[model samples]
Target: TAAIPDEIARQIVLPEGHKDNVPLFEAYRWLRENQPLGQARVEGYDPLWLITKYADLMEVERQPQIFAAGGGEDKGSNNPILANQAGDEFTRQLLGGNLRILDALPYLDQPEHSVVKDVAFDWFRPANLKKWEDRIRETARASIDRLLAGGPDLDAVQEFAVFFPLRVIMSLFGVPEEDEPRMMALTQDFFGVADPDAQRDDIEALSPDAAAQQWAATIADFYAYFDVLVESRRAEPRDDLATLIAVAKDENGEYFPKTFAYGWFVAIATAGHDTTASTLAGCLQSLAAHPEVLDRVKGDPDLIPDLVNESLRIVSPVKHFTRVALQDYEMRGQKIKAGDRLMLLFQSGNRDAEVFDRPDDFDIDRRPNKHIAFGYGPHMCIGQHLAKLELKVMLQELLPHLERVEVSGEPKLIQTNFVGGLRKLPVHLTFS
Candidate 1:
């Protein structure tokens, strides 16, 4: 088996590697060519198998029983998502020695993952999601109007992309307009523990331990907010997603545990909009980079979906998700023993040269663009349809209002290896 060099391994796992993505993608290219299934023994982090190729990532994800998601002291495993040893240790203690922080789909193993997933299965279905298109489009229009009102020049990531989906998801959750700022703050802190501008002010500098503490506090803040929302929904039923989750039941016709409800809320509240926001910001950056592509998209508005897919492929906002080997498994000429942890590098797989022609090129017309941006198998993103719709609708509304657009300054990415994308994107636009 290939042992990835520490310098190279750090690119894919460290926060510095993600802040400026050039070296990170370069390291991925090297690993994909030399060691498709390589072992990473970076300092301060547990040894992990870096699944670099597209096919191998899909292979591991499809067999959930073999590669488990659940992890904790009870499971004799590390965090299912990558974390440095110190961070993992502190997180385990914070979770009362359990690694599954949220008990959500990303961290749950099947039978339980599948059972919990079914609770709100129908809510995210395409048919049900389509009913909200008009409302989503209206939100899209308002967001675009706001952008134009403030523009000629603006940071799209801060001013536009973050809010549209935030409005959409919170509206669906029955969260009132006033509480959105709190939800937004908590979501940013949870995902951005390593991000200087996004992390808590209490931390003077970024370190794994400090980041973990910041993350723990952010989670508590989320639970505090969700506690009131969950209780309110239970007391007075509302025609919203919160009510459905509050009253969710298991196959035995019993009320699911409060942990399940909190998990559901946390997953939706944070992941529901942030990933989409990242993607939207990425899409704008891409369009600004290639104005010709924007011109083509403006002429053929129907290509908005294609634009969305291509952006998702290139951006791949959700960087990686981890899994533990439940049994000895062989992949890509390498052996992984039972209990060995693995990081499925979705960002790397999304650009696999073997899968797509000119894989790095942002061609909206690239057909069969099979990106694992939302992940794969039983734990594929539940809100993928909603994210796509948000992207498509936002593009549809914003493009028509722009006569011309281009990046006005350098763009920067969030400095976290987990769940990150463009955190700052500056653009100049001329109104139609």
Candidate 2:
């Protein structure tokens, strides 16, 4: 870890220095008020250990054996050039046919990240996710009746947060409801390769030798749109998460890793609904620019899961992560050796004012909100209980047919430095 403070290494890897959240938490409050364990670098990546303090990201997500993740054997974490082309195809086996879903799930770590997160926790069994909440609130009431048939010039990141988690995550991986607008245009060109109206034409390739030849033609367009449902769910297996990750196994009889069943169907077809469509389009553009905090969760329906964790704590959409340091430590005085690299950032520890309290007020009556943003050990977020049941049934069936909203233009984002949010919110609403 060397010389950081070049304005915290160009504001923590400036991909347009993470376009505003009040100048990215005013540069994570000047590295948590002056080099709170710093060193970023960012001139041609690699060199991190940033951690904008919140009890040192709970001392590095409570020490995952002195920090390591998919990149443990140097397969590089968090897209270090697609973990260096998935390090010689994850040696031995498990990476067949286009690095088998290009080893996805945030680039695996321990025991192939608990043998593919225990096969998506035995098929998302929180009582089979409360029996799929009346089919995820009937696909968010048919995506709030097409965002109330476009009442007020909404773009809400493409008329209702990119088609309500791409029609409730491609109809919970059974997929074809007319290929859910071709999996929402290849999940917005796999998280907008650096937005030009959502990386449509790879926005004319931003040279990493033309974006790794457009990331090998978007991994041969996700292995020709998921090898026809991974060979029709390995020849006839059904009942969904793409046929339980195409016939999954591992309660001792082994199996689970053919590059984590093609990185668990490429993280359920591209980051299981674009980090829940950029925190459901940055919490419907911060609840139409904060109408007194949406009039206290629109007069409390049990504070709508604290307005979905205070709109995922002001839209901390899955922003940062990159671990390494498997030996020499020190932290909060810096030093840190054994293959350094830390990052974390979860949009600067979900705005950490000593673990938030007026940390950046969105506050659905902010309780003890320990916001890790689906992260806090054993590499959290295995479809975080199906992205908080698609943010509590799409804001309890689209905030009861919306009583109000505003802001009508200019809101763009998505320049990219590892998944930011809202690539155009531009609201204007009033329905009921």
Candidate 3:
């Protein structure tokens, strides 16, 4: 029923608003309190129903039939992901007038979504993941070795945090270590297209077509590289997720469409590690700010899971996902027309005061922590188990060698509204 103020709504959409999150959280706090189901009428973007409350988010997510993942065309919007008018059109045009870009999981709906997810579902199950623990530990230990050698003083994000998850995911796909940097650049190009410091140099940040061009090039590269990967895996199957995806079967026992297979690879490749890396960097930032919390976890390694959960709660790297209303719906005294877009701000939900006792504080012992950083419902993050394991193993290997740690300089956040957290985290360290 309430129309959000332009200034308040801008904080929720603009990339700059996320760089310093105080204003962004403030806007969310106001929306959650004043208008839990407020409508956003920001110019250059489709009018959207902003779901700020935790309950509303869960309700919307749980009913995928009523709220779709890819129905943007109903309201003149095309991309399921949030983008401005031009960006959305660009996405539609890039897909050859078909907004359904099957290469990315976020753009899929219902029966199709579940079908595509089955491809790598078992490969990431905890039971399957357990077999890779030793390998994960080895990767963590080597990352820490590099951390210790270069440290005493270093940027944890650049020196240690980013590489551990990157290495783990690449190895999972059977990619050579030498090709890791190439993967990193492609990820930045995709997620950081709107971020000036991270986007490709050929395009300036403010250009109307900047995001569009950057996004197109990024996907082109991913498809090109993964096409070769799919072929290799087909010629010689390997003990990796890539091979499983290459040979995956549908319910009818037919091979997945080429678009679906490539989309699966692109999704796993980009999302597999970026979110984890952001959480890892955020954890270092939190620990540096609260040495007492770090000491508590160091003393009792059993609390490692709690620490990882708390970190995921506080960081919330994946920001929001867009869903379209499949039919006219009403909730919280607000009426949403069919085909209306909805923004489920996961970051806002994670910090909702109604859900957590002290939502802003990073308390590792905060029990009953049910944060939606990985999202909820059928579309929940598929790589969450692997992400948590990576964090747990890294902490176990690194904490044992740390006598003390604290931030050495200002930390910088990526200027992207989607799938972002700390990009720079400088720290002062001391070895045990």
- Top candidate, metric lDDT: 1
Candidate 3 Cα misplacement greater than 4 A, ranges: 72-78, 202-205
Model 1, span 1-432: residue lDDT tens:
557988889998787788888889989999988877888998888888998899998898899878888853245255666778888888778767766677667777767788889988899998999989999999999888788778588888888889999999999988898989999888889888877778697754556587777877887888888888878887898899999999887778887887788888988999899999999888878877788998899999999999999999999988888888877898777789988889989989988999988888899888767888988888888999999988888889889887776888999888998989987888887788
Looking at model 2, residue 94 earns an lDDT score of: 35
Which of the predicted structures, 1 or 3, would earn the higher lDDT when compared with the native?
1
- Candidate 2 per-residue lDDT, tens place, 250-334, comes to 7887655555566567667767887788887777777777876666666776788878887786787767767778789886666
Clashing pairs in 3: 103-263
lDDT of 2 at 280: 75
Candidate achieving higher TM-score, 2 or 3: 3
How many residue pairs clash in each candidate at the backbone level?
Answer: 0, 4, 1
Choose 2 or 3, whichever is better by lDDT: 3
Q: What's the best-to-worst order under TM-score?
A: 1, 3, 2
> Which residues of candidate 1, in runs, are more than 4 Å off?
72-76, 202-208
